[PDB]
Specification:
The chain is mainly beta. The protein folds into two domains: 60 residues, SH3 type barrels; 55 residues, Vcp-like ATPase, Chain A, domain 2 (Roll). The protein has one helix and six strands. This is Lysine-specific demethylase 4A. Interacts with histone deacetylase proteins HDAC1, HDAC2 and HDAC3. Interacts with RB and NCOR1. Interacts with VRK1. Interacts with FBXO22; this interaction promotes KDM4A ubiquitination. (Microbial infection) Interacts with HTLV-1 Tax protein.
Length: 115
């Protein structure tokens, strides 16, 4: 069930197919959740995407705090901070040297059927 660093596993390469890869490292990724001013919700902002304060340096905003966020379209939007969410993830390396950081559910052990 648990995956450890140094373990050969199976996961999708960037080209979209399953290959054997090796777990390089277990990382922790912190995601921010915010409610935009129009009421739309985001669950996977990075701390650096908050542009009204320096969260990389001083941690997350207070729950409910007004913020501005730089969105994936490069534009800035008004929002309110909802929650911060650390997630255990797996940095994997493929045969060709390419790497990805993936979630537990996207990793398979060598003995298991690929769905």
């Amino acid at each position: 069930q648990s995956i450890t660093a140094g373990q050969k596993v199976i996961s999708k390469h960037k080209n979209g197919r399953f290959y054997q890869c090796e777990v390089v490292r277990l990382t922790t990724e912190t995601f921010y959740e915010v409610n935009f001013d129009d009421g739309s919700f985001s669950d996977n902002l990075y701390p650096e995407d908050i542009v009204s304060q320096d969260c990389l340096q001083f941690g997350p905003p207070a729950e409910g705090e007004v913020v501005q966020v730089r969105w994936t379209d490069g534009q800035v939007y008004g929002a309110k901070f909802v929650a911060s969410h650390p997630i255990q993830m797996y940095q994997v390396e493929f045969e060709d040297g390419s790497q990805l950081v993936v979630k537990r559910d996207d990793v398979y052990t060598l003995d298991e059927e690929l769905p």
